[PDB]
Amino acid sequence: GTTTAVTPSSLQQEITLLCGEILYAKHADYKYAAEIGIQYISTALGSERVQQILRNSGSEVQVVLTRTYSLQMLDIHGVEKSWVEEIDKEARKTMATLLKESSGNIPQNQRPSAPDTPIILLCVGALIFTKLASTIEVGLETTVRRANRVLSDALKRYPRMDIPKIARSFYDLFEQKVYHRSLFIEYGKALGSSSTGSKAESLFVNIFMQAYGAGQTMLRWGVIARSSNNIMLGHVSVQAELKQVTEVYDLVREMGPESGLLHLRQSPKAGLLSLANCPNFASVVLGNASGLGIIGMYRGRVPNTELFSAAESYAKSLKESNKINFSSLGLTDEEKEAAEHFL
Amino acid sequence: MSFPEGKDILFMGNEAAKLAEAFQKSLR
16 A cells, blocks of 8 residues: 655654754755645654544544654655755755855854744645645745745845745655645644744744635635625525525534635535535626725636626725725735735 | 524525615615
């Protein structure tokens, strides 16, 4: 069957160093950077607990423990030794050079051994994870731009950190190893509970927690359409979808915020989160969002363009006459900023 | 975030249908 790496908690310091080495130097290839981040998670949660989590996600993947060898290196299952050795070599070369230029005096928080380097690495992963959780498609480059602002302080400490290539590594990992989405969820839930409130942990938790709302975006926009009193919500073809609209909101009502992860998890009920069974409703919901100015750069499907345009015109006229109560809508801060151009 | 029932999101009834139809018609 299929296999994947876990790393025992006894090697937490060593995997921490490897994460730091990824950030610390300008590397040619970041292919397995995301997998190293995952290895840190496994030391945090415990390798046997990871096997449980994967099994429970519906995967029969078998975990294989990381070992050590000397040329001290980590032997990580499914990660080419040449890659790990090259990351380490390039980091150590860079450190030797910089250490000498600074006469042996480099602050801890600029070194690859700084304890928050795995968390920093995982913050890039967290942004890719919340991108993935959303029912609204955005380009990877958009997310990369966001990572640059969010991790501006990390970039001052680690000015050779290659965010776009690290981002691509996490993007690929979540596409190829779907079970590691479930592992990431358990880590985020665990850290949400155990966070010391440090800067790195707080950033991770704040990004991670956005995944729930991201999954529910279109349903939240639906409520916004009603709070906007969009009269196209009364169109005959929309009223006809009442049982389907009911199924959709019954889902989130009964499940609570966890339902936001169904898209990410590729659950059989994920389509509901994208309003797949109620296309006319969806068109009014999207049109209303467009009219309010909160839809951003939406490249997704508009099932009924006439309904969309009508809903958009109506929202827009209410907006232009200052008849929208923007405080009461339940907008995100970014949506508020987009619609009103102040926060 | 508190989600209402679907029947509290849509505008149901003949009157609501006629209102939406009229607005749509006004847009040519």
